[PDB]
Amino acid sequence: EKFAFQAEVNRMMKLIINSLYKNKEIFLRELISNASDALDKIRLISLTDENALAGNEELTVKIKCDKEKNLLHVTDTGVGMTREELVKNLGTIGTSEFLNKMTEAQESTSELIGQFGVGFYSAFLVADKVIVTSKHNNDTQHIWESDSNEFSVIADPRGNTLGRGTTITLVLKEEASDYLELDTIKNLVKKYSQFINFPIYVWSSKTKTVWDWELMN
Ligand SMILES: CCNC(=O)[C@H]1O[C@@H](n2cnc3c(N)ncnc32)[C@H](O)[C@@H]1O
């Protein structure tokens, strides 16, 4: 259940965190970009697999703020991940070139992070803990969590609650509490969803005060 990150991943997490220090809100752009890719994959599968979308008939990205819990949630209904995939895909990693590319560019990698497929780690810039709950058609719902010093994966004792997809839950750092603010979230989600071809909603409030999904693109 408990794993260590690959040496290269530790170096990469540090690089990413060190360079994006001043431009932190791109973590949201990167997570949204990953959710898009997840949806594209499931959509490509729905073409050859008639049952692919069985677990969840929708193809969306929903974001919600839990200010009391101090949590940020980014859930997609994409391909999702198996237990093995959570361990390999997040715990392991043009890797060597990217390393030299990043260092020589820090001595704006904001674009070089999205280029390569490692924007997920940028979450650690605003979170102390990152939790990945995911449901894949060929496995049971699992949870991956890490504070960057190690990571573990277990079976979700809650069972299949997603159907299919992934929820990225970020335990926000104290100085990152502005991201629990709906409007701070909407400005960032409306800015980073304008290129995404799947609908992105933010659990917002309207006034008396009812809550519901508000589309962002
Ligand atoms: C190096 C960081 N790891 C990733 O972003 C990879 O992990 C998996 N991943 C990350 N976020 C998601 C997601 N929301 N849905 C599906 N796979 C994901 C993909 O294979 C990514 O390429």
* Sheet hosting strand 127-135, strand order edge to edge: 2-3, 151-155, 142-146, 127-135, 165-172, 71-76, 61-66, 200-206, 210-215
Q: CA 217, CA 33: separation in Å to the nearest integer?
A: 14
CB-based contacts of 143-150 (< 8 A; 24+ apart in sequence): 144/86, 144/87, 144/90, 146/5, 146/90, 148/5, 148/13, 148/124, 150/2, 150/3, 150/4, 150/5
> Which neighbouring-strand residues pair with 203?
213
Pairing of strands 200-206, 61-66: parallel
**What fold is seen in the domain 1-217?**
Heat Shock Protein 90 (3.30.565)
Residue corresponding to tokens 């508000």? 214
Query: What number of H helices and E strands is found in the chain?
Result: 6, 9
For the CA of 79, the closest atom of ligand 1 is 16
Asked if 71 contacts 170 with a C-beta cutoff of 8 angstroms, the reply is yes
The Cα–Cα gap between 46 and 17 comes to 36
Q: Which residues line ligand 1 (CB under 6 A)?
A: 34-35, 38, 76, 78-79, 81, 89-90, 93, 117-118, 120, 166
In total, the chain counts a number of residues equal to 217
Quick one: DSSP state of residue 120? G
Q: Which residue lies with its CA nearest to atom 16 of ligand 1?
A: 38
Residue with token string 């994966």: 153
Cβ(125)–Cβ(20) below 8 Å: yes
What's the rounded Cα separation, in Å, for the pair 38 and 113? Answer: 17
70 among annotated binding-site residues: no
Question: Using CA atoms, how far apart are residues 54 and 46, in angstroms rounded to an integer?
Answer: 10
From 120, 137, 153, mutation site for ligand 1 pocket: most ligand atoms within 8 A of C-beta? 120
Which among 176, 183, 187 is positioned nearest to 20, based on CA atoms?
176
The atom of ligand 1 lying closest to the CA of 41 is: 16
